[PDB]
Design an enzyme around this catalytic site. Structure first.
Site, PDB file in Angstrom:
ATOM      1  N   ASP A 219     -53.953 -20.006 -17.569  1.00 28.62           N
ATOM      2  CA  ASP A 219     -53.211 -20.278 -18.799  1.00 28.62           C
ATOM      3  C   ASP A 219     -53.185 -21.778 -19.072  1.00 28.62           C
ATOM      4  O   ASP A 219     -52.383 -22.476 -18.465  1.00 28.62           O
ATOM      5  CB  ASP A 219     -51.780 -19.774 -18.678  1.00 28.62           C
ATOM      6  CG  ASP A 219     -50.997 -19.851 -19.994  1.00 28.62           C
ATOM      7  OD1 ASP A 219     -51.316 -20.712 -20.851  1.00 28.62           O
ATOM      8  OD2 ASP A 219     -50.063 -19.045 -20.158  1.00 28.62           O
TER       9      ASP A 219
ATOM     10  N   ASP B 276     -56.275 -19.502 -25.071  1.00 26.24           N
ATOM     11  CA  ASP B 276     -55.555 -20.275 -24.065  1.00 26.24           C
ATOM     12  C   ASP B 276     -55.423 -19.544 -22.727  1.00 26.24           C
ATOM     13  O   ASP B 276     -54.789 -20.055 -21.811  1.00 26.24           O
ATOM     14  CB  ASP B 276     -54.170 -20.576 -24.708  1.00 26.24           C
ATOM     15  CG  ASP B 276     -53.130 -20.968 -23.757  1.00 26.24           C
ATOM     16  OD1 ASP B 276     -53.391 -21.852 -22.908  1.00 26.24           O
ATOM     17  OD2 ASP B 276     -52.018 -20.414 -23.881  1.00 26.24           O
ATOM     18  N   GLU B 277     -56.017 -18.373 -22.580  1.00 28.11           N
ATOM     19  CA  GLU B 277     -55.615 -17.479 -21.511  1.00 28.11           C
ATOM     20  C   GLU B 277     -56.757 -16.576 -21.121  1.00 28.11           C
ATOM     21  O   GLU B 277     -57.330 -15.894 -21.965  1.00 28.11           O
ATOM     22  CB  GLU B 277     -54.421 -16.611 -21.945  1.00 28.11           C
ATOM     23  CG  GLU B 277     -53.016 -17.277 -21.783  1.00 28.11           C
ATOM     24  CD  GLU B 277     -51.854 -16.381 -22.305  1.00 28.11           C
ATOM     25  OE1 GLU B 277     -52.198 -15.417 -23.028  1.00 28.11           O
ATOM     26  OE2 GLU B 277     -50.639 -16.639 -22.032  1.00 28.11           O
TER      27      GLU B 277
HETATM   28 CA   LIG Z   1     -50.632 -22.258 -22.452  1.00 27.12          CA
END
Ligand SMILES: [Ca+2]
Ligand SMILES: Nc1ncnc2c1ncn2[C@H]1C[C@H](O)[C@@H](COP(=O)(O)OP(=O)(O)OP(=O)(O)O)O1
Length: 341
Positions: free
Chosen positions: A7, A105-106
């Site tokens: 993350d 983002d992940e």
């Molecule tokens: Ca983040």
DNA sequence: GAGCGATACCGTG
DNA sequence: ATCACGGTATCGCTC
């Protein structure tokens, strides 16, 4: 299995900080400016320096300036972030063929068949934080555990720039101690729907009867919560394939004049068709946020793919249908394409 | 009884 | 008082 979740910390801000390193140490707030009035809009993210003081995603820009009027306020450059993200992502593919990209983002990796134990796994997550810092100068947080949910909870508990393992014993601990509202997928509406039912921990969903729970949150989120509390949640890492692509734009001023919304609407189609690349959708959905900030859509699926010209004329028809079947004025208009060949 | 597009709700980023 | 995605609940139609 063994799941490793990555993350990216404060991602939009940190990318701005990587590009303009003069910014490090300062509060940065990446904003999304709307154009009704000067500094109208909302915050997309801030860095820790700004987050410390209550400047977080979702608040209006004007409130963020009242708290930190001397912060750096940057307009969102999503295309740039998306481009960096892509490169971080092509880099995670060196560590597992089973990779699921969850957002800008992940990412989740099933590293089950590239480590034996969580010490090996932990080790592979230091490597990966290093590789990403080396190649792109971006700090991340790693979370490792036996499924996606507890790998994500591990990252939450470790950010920023963290790494944490939640072994099988700590999983059983959390199922008992962890407040159910911190479980992924449990937002404020359903958090409250639970507390209402006395549900505060995950274990609690096993004493309550299923249809009281189902009748309150949905069969699916009910089953989801129950399977976690039984430590029987396994969802495979699966490759994400985007399903929709749209764009909504806020109008300088509310309206229900068809010839007045039409240019925003048509701007929204243009942008969305560019964001589609070679993806040919069969479904188009027109989307208006009401004056009251409700969201109301109207759509149509097609035996065939939708040309831009079809998109232009079908969207106007769909917007007409929004204005007849409702009396509320329109604050923002957009479209969402879907069902691709 | 339950499978299908429209549409809303709800979560997260 | 942003924009974006995408999962699931509900209805009405349909078998
Ligand atoms: Ca983040
Ligand atoms: N409400 C929002 N609107 C727009 N973009 C958002 C919003 N929330 C988060 N984002 C974007 C910006 C963040 O860099 C990225 C990842 O979000 P998240 O992990 O919640 O926060 P963070 O990386 O800033 O810490 O998602």
């Amino acid at each position: 299995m063994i799941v490793l979740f990555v993350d990216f910390d404060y991602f939009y801000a940190q990318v701005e900080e990587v590009l303009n390193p003069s910014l490090k140490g300062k509060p940065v707030v990446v904003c999304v400016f709307s154009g009704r009035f000067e500094d109208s809009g909302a915050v997309a993210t801030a860095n820790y320096e700004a987050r410390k003081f209550g400047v977080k995603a979702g608040i209006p820009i004007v409130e963020a300036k009242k708290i930190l009027p001397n912060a750096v306020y940057l307009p969102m450059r999503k295309e740039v972030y998306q481009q960096v993200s892509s490169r971080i992502m092509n880099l995670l593919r060196e560590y597992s063929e089973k990779i699921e990209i969850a957002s800008i983002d992940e990412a989740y990796l099933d590293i089950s068949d590239k480590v034996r134990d969580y010490r090996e796994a932990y080790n592979l997550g230091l490597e990966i934080k290093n590789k990403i810092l080396e190649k792109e100068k971006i700090t991340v947080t790693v979370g490792i555990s036996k499924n996606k949910v507890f790998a994500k909870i591990a990252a939450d508990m470790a950010k920023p720039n963290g790494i944490k393992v939640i072994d099988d014993e700590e999983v059983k601990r959390l199922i008992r101690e962890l407040d159910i509202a911190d479980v992924p997928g449990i937002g404020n509406i359903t958090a409250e729907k639970l507390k209402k039912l006395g549900i505060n921990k995950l274990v609690d969903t096993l004493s309550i009867e299923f249809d009281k729970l189902k009748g309150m949150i949905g069969e699916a989120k009910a089953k989801y919560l129950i399977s976690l509390a039984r430590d029987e949640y396994n969802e495979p890492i699966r490759t994400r394939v985007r399903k929709s692509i749209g764009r909504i734009v806020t109008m300088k001023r509310n309206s229900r004049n068809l010839e007045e919304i039409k240019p925003y609407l048509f701007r929204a189609i243009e942008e969305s068709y560019y964001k589609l690349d070679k993806r040919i959708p069969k479904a188009i959905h027109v989307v208006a946020v009401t004056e009251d900030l409700d969201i109301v859509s109207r759509g149509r699926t097609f035996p065939h793919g939708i040309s831009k010209e079809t998109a232009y004329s079908e969207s106007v028809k769909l917007l007409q249908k929004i204005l007849e079947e409702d009396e509320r004025k329109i604050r923002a208009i957009g479209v969402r394409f879907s069902k691709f060949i």
